[PDB]
């Protein structure tokens, strides 16, 4: 049975809302993938989550109560104000925007325009489609927001359409990183 | 069930495994990797180098909490009457970082979710041949169900005659699983 | 310099 594998996990969480006006500090103790003990600032003390944590609850609350409660300030609030403010909360990566047509262009035939919006940060963004300067609401859909893993995201936004003479389709993108909205045009030849 | 907020900071996630005394120490902010501490070099490795110039973290804090991981993994193992971890089969998804353009430098991303336990091999194959360069990967990220996910990156040049596979080797898989991808 | 949540020892 040498192939038996064992592991523990310690997962701390500082939940911030409206700056640091509201903070919820949660600490999870895990064996293999079973959370057996947890500290939650809203609760105010350590609580056994499963039978496995029964032996710890009392000891943890008697020994680490004050120190753990204080981390809401000494770790959470401190890290937010002193380290996140100047980095994470300051990161602004402008999205790259390009348009592609799904099928070969056939005048007056159904098709799909795909607006690829990539490499942006933070995750909050808004993409709109326009046909001859008028916003399209029907036939618009999008893929799931993708977290690239390198502090950038991407998303594909599609527009079911029918290319007609002289039409100009515009992919419109609003994001905190842009002083003004990015607009890319696709013209029906 | 999930707790909601504007931002989430995980300052000091500890993962300690046995046998092999395997550990990982990371900082996460809103789901992204701030850094991981290389326990052998005793060095904090930042995902975004520009960040390390405005903030820092003494790797010793990683060593300390990792040591406590080793301690707790033993007290808990014994306390559980040696209940071992139950393997899961991971799932891979392959996609490009930016739109693929012939001859345009790009990056292939292999996202692997449902990883458990956090021990795995993620490599790439080009034309069925393993790639040994331009490959990099994140640390293990935590999931709500306490399983993990990880991403591997492969720099490449889009070409009509190139085939790619993200190979994933894990104990929960009989044979390595290949997630194919073609431009 | 950043602070870190302390993994507390049991027993």
């Amino acid at each position, epitope marked *: 049975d040498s192939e038996r594998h064992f592991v523990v996990q310690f997962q701390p969480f500082c939940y911030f809302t409206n700056g640091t006006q509201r903070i919820r500090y949660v600490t999870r103790y895990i064996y293999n993938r079973e959370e057996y003990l947890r500290f939650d600032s809203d609760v105010g003390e350590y609580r056994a989550v499963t039978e496995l944590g029964r032996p710890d609850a009392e000891y943890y609350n008697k*020994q*680490y109560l*004050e*120190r753990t409660r*204080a*981390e809401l*300030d*000494t*770790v959470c609030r*401190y890290n937010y104000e002193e380290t996140e403010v100047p980095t994470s909360l300051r990161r602004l990566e402008q999205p790259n925007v390009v348009i592609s047509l799904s099928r070969t262009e056939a005048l007056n035939h159904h098709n799909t325009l795909v607006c690829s919006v990539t490499d942006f940060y933070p995750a909050k963004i808004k993409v709109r489609w326009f046909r001859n300067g008028q916003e399209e609401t029907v036939g618009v859909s999008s893929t799931q927001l993708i977290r690239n893993g390198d502090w950038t995201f991407q998303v594909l936004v599609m527009l079911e359409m029918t290319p007609r003479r002289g039409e100009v389709y515009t992919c419109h993108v609003e994001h905190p990183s842009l002083k003004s909205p990015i607009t890319v045009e696709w013209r029906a030849q | 069930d999930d707790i909601e907020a504007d931002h989430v900071g995980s300052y*000091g996630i500890v993962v300690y495994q046995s046998p092999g005394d395997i550990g990982q120490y990371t900082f996460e902010f809103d789901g992204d990797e701030l850094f991981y501490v290389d326990l052998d070099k005793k060095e904090t490795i930042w995902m975004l180098p520009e960040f390390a110039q405005l903030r820092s*973290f*003494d790797p*010793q*804090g*990683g*060593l*300390q*909490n990792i*040591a*406590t991981g*080793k*301690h707790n993994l033993g007290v808990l193992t014994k306390r559980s009457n040696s209940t071992p971890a139950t393997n899961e089969a991971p799932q891979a998804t392959v996609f490009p970082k930016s739109p693929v353009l012939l001859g345009q430098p790009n990056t292939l991303i292999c996202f692997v979710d449902n990883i458990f336990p956090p021990v795995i091999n993620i490599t790439w194959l080009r034309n069925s041949k393993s790639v040994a360069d331009g490959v990099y990967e994140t640390s293990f990220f935590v999931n709500r169900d306490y399983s993990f996910h990880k991403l591997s990156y492969l720099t490449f040049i889009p070409s009509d005659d190139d085939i790619y596979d993200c190979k994933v080797e894990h104990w929960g898989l009989e044979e390595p699983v290949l997630k194919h991808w073609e431009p | *310099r*950043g*602070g*870190a*949540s*302390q993994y*507390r*020892p049991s027993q």
Partner: T-cell receptor
Amino acid sequence: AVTQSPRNKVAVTGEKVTLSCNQTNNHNNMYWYRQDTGHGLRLIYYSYGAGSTEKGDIPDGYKASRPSQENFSLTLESATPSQTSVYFCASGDASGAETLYFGPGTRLTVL
Amino acid sequence: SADSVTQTGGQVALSEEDFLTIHCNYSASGYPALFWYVQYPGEGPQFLFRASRDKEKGSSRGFEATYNKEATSFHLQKASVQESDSAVYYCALSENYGNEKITFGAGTKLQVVP
């Protein structure tokens, strides 16, 4: 209780000196400090567990070993007069902002 | 500079039943926990109490100190000292880094005259 060995020791310049520390508190952390007038206590070396050795604030001229949980030694390869001091060993449970349990000290004088 | 603790000069002499105050100000780069230790003759320092955040008060055997982040102080207080209180008091701190490296001050010698 934390116990140090030896309690007293006179050495000559260039001598190889080793101070021993033992604790049965089952503490994961162990530390070596020196105490000197004007400086108070200064950390030389500490350990997070068996096999680990971390440099303190003033490691120069010193070396340490943590061969087991209970024991932690400090070694002065080549004793110099500046190393004359009172050395204190302490153990702790490695719980953030942990309290230290000190030994009664070892008075070392290098002549 | 590296974190440091600054406490009253060297030696102070009081009469029994006098009130005791030993100053301690700290210079730290993070958000440290603060402590006071007492070292009686022929012994090593022994823990008195700690305080993890601003406004928190630690206490033990009549001694107490309040975390004051505004003045970066952790001044020791004792209502009425006794001869047996004669010893060396140390101010110390640990950082929120998870480091567990405890930094001590220079110590203050207290002589409570019989």
